[PDB]
Structures are given as C-alpha cells and as structure tokens.
A paper describes a structure:
Mycobacterium tuberculosis (MTB) H37Rv is predicted to encode three COMTs, i.e., Rv1220, Rv1703, and Rv0187, which share 29 to 36% amino acid sequence identity. Here, we present two crystal structures of Rv0187 from MTB H37Rv with and without cofactors at 1.64 and 2.08 Å resolution, respectively. The protein adopts the Rossmann fold typical for numerous SAM-dependent methyltransferases, containing seven core β-sheets surrounded by eight α-helices (α1α2α3β1α4β2α5β3α6β4α7β5α8β6β7).
An asymmetric unit (ASU) of the ligand-free structure contains four copies of the monomer. The overall conformation of ligand-free and cofactor-bound forms is highly similar, with an average Cα rmsd of 0.347 Å between monomers. The buried surface areas at the dimerization interface are estimated to be 3,780 Å2 between A and B chains and 3,820 Å2 between C and D chains in the ligand-free structure. Furthermore, the rearrangement of the α2-α3 loop forces Leu-70 to flip, which causes the protrusion of the side chain into the binding pocket for the methionyl moiety of SAH. Another noteworthy conformational feature in the ligand-free structure is that the side chain of Asp-139 swings away from the divalent metal binding site and interacts with the backbone carbonyl groups of Ile-67 and Gly-68 instead.
Residue numbers in the entry:
A (entry chain B), B (entry chain A): 6 to 220
Write the structure that this text describes.
C-alpha cells in the first residue's frame, strides 16, 4: 500500500509539524494562482539546513514562487542573513511579500521584480554563498552562468526539478524535459562546477535536484 | 517508460563519469561478500560536495561498507581532512583499507575496527564537522546520540536508508523498517537537532536519508 505522498505526510508530521506561516503561504499562493510550489516541506527544510550548514549570509533565489522556498532559505540564513529573490510577475511578488511578512522574515528578504535575465546583471552587495534556482527552466543555462558569476568560490548552487518523472531520458517532444536534460549536461561539462543530481519522490512526485560546488 | 535506475545511469555518465578507483572498490566489496553499498554514485558525490560546502576537516563515518562512501567523504574533506570510519568485521575493514589505498586517500582515513558502541567512546579524532551513518540500523538511536556528543555545534549528521521502500509506514515483518521509523521519530523530537528526510529513487531503489544540524 505505502506510496511516497503517504511517507511525506508522515515525514512532515514527524520532522516539520504545525507551521502556520508555511500553510498560509501555500493557501495564499493557491488563491493568487501562482505556479505550483517547486519544493515539498522536506525539500524546503533541506534548503534551510543546507544554508545553516554552510553559514550562508547572502542567498540568491531565482523564482520566488510565493516565497515558500524563500521562507525556508531566510530561516536558514538566520538573524544576520539576507536573501535576494527574483520574481517575474508584480502580483506574484506582492503575494510573496505578504507571505514573508506573516512568517516574520520580511526584514531578511528583498524581492526584486522583473525578468531575471534583466535583473541579474543589476544585483550588487557582493557574491552569494548559496544560489537556488526553481523557475523558468528554459532559461536555466543562462541562470547557471549568472549563478557562477554572482557566487563566491566554494558556494553551493541548487537547481530544482532536473528529472521531470524521467522525461529527461526519452521526451524530445517535451521542451520542459529537454530544458532539464540540457541543464544537467551543462552542469556536468562546466569546468567551474562540480555537480551531482539526487532523484526525489514524495508529495511533489518523481523529480530531483542538482547540487553543485563553484570551484 | 523511463525508470529511476535508467535516469541514474544517465546522471552517472553526465555528472560522475569514469571513476576506476570507485568501480574497483564496488567490485572488491562484491567479491568479499560485504553487504550492499548504501549510497549510489550520485548520493556518494552528494556526501563529497556537502563535505566541501561546509569545509569539513573531521568526518565520522559509522559503517565503512567497503569504503565507497569513505572515498567520497575523503575527497570532500580534501588533502587536510581526516575521516574516521567504524567497521565491525576485520575482513570488511581489510577490503576498505585496500579500496582506500587504491583511491589514493588512505593517508586521510583511519579505519577503526570493532563494534561501534565499544569504539565510539574511545574516539579522540573530533569534534566532527560531518557524521555519516549507514550501517546497523537497530543501533541508530545510540549512534545519533554519540554523533551529537562527538560533533561541533552546526555539524551535519546524515543517516542513510530511513524510508525502506515505504516500509516505515506498515513495517511489522521488518526489523529494518521498524528501526528506520524509530530513528525518524527520535530525530524529530530531539531538541539538540533540526532534521529533514529526503525520499530518494535511483540505482539503490526507493529509500531516503535524514539530514540534521546539531544545535
């Protein structure tokens, strides 16, 4: 009987528990018709613990998607940390701001509105410790080149949804699956990166994330 | 129909490539009838990148299992890093030492032979930055308590195989599934830890790992 969504409900109850600020962010994102949140609670808390493990003080997020991922990163970056998150749609940006205010981390977060390919070149404040990429996968090759350019040596880059239910193997038909396949090929062959990819299951289905160190 | 083992062969080719030292460690472990290695190449490289990301200098591994996991950790800890790895069986310990010598990391690794509950109290190679636990699940609660005791604040603990194909949900037959369920509930209620669990698929099947920060 047991399937990965059922295991994730057990893991959420056991390791995350009641988190009204996250519940409210997911509800508000549904009401405003954002795209689906990219990370499960377990995957989001992974990003939180990764940020804490490396003592991330400056985090770049490409794809705010309602700020569920952003809340986790801002919690992990801690009282002194700062997250810069890039959102395309101003309405989506406003949803994220309210979700961040309700979670008590709006002071750690700057939401930067506009197409990421136009706003990435305009970022200052200095190099990032951690870059998280989870929207607009057609532009992943450009986002990864920008991530490398904006990140310190030894920084972590995480790219969400690089597996697409195994579509990356046999689906030339699907632009989405092709774009995920292309981001893996780019991360593997880039001499500025050392990269792995973890296939995941749970409440977000069969997918996975790439994780790289900047050399 | 793409499946996770097929996706992992593509991920291994793209992100890991030919690694004769690792191939030889897996072959020698099979010949000497060790238990199955706990981590895939992608999961092993994850441990490598995690060690590099946190700048691990002192790594504790509980369950050498032929030293596949250990080679990844020793590569990630770098030339200045030290790995202490605990193996129960002397024959298994000898396989691991040869695999470590062939991978050129023997000087970074001390294999400590005996029951982990007898050797853990004797370790002075800490405090540890990173603890990896992948053997003898029935003793996981004790291993995690020892991990916390021997680890610095902010240290990472990773516990392999905490999902068991979903067996942790209706597990009565299986000592392993029972033990995995107990390790999740212990990690979730421990005030000295913050913990998540990532469900994985790929060449090692449907399982997962817990990742915790030591508070």
């Amino acid at each position: 009987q047991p399937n990965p969504p059922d295991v994730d409900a057990f893991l959420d109850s056991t390791l995350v528990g009641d988190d009204p600020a996250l519940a409210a962010a997911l509800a508000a994102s549904d009401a405003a018709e954002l795209p689906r949140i990219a990370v499960s609670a377990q995957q989001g808390k992974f990003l939180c613990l990764l940020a804490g493990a490396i003592q991330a003080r400056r985090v770049l997020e490409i794809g705010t998607l309602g700020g569920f991922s952003t809340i986790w990163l801002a919690r992990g970056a801690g009282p002194q940390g700062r997250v810069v998150t890039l959102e395309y749609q101003p309405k989506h940006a406003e949803v994220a701001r309210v979700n961040l205010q309700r979670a008590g981390v709006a002071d750690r977060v700057e939401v930067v509105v506009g197409p990421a390919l136009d706003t990435l070149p305009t970022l200052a404040g200095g190099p990032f410790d951690l870059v998280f990429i989870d929207a607009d996968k057609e532009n992943n090759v450009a986002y990864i080149q920008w991530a490398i350019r904006l990140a310190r040596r030894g920084a972590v880059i995480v790219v969400d949804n690089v597996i697409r239910g195994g579509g990356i193997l046999a689906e030339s038909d699907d632009a989405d699956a092709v774009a995920a396949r292309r981001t893996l090929q780019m991360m593997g062959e880039h001499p500025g990166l050392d990269a792995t990819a973890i296939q995941t299951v749970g409440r977000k289905g069969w997918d996975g994330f790439a994780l790289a160190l900047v050399r």
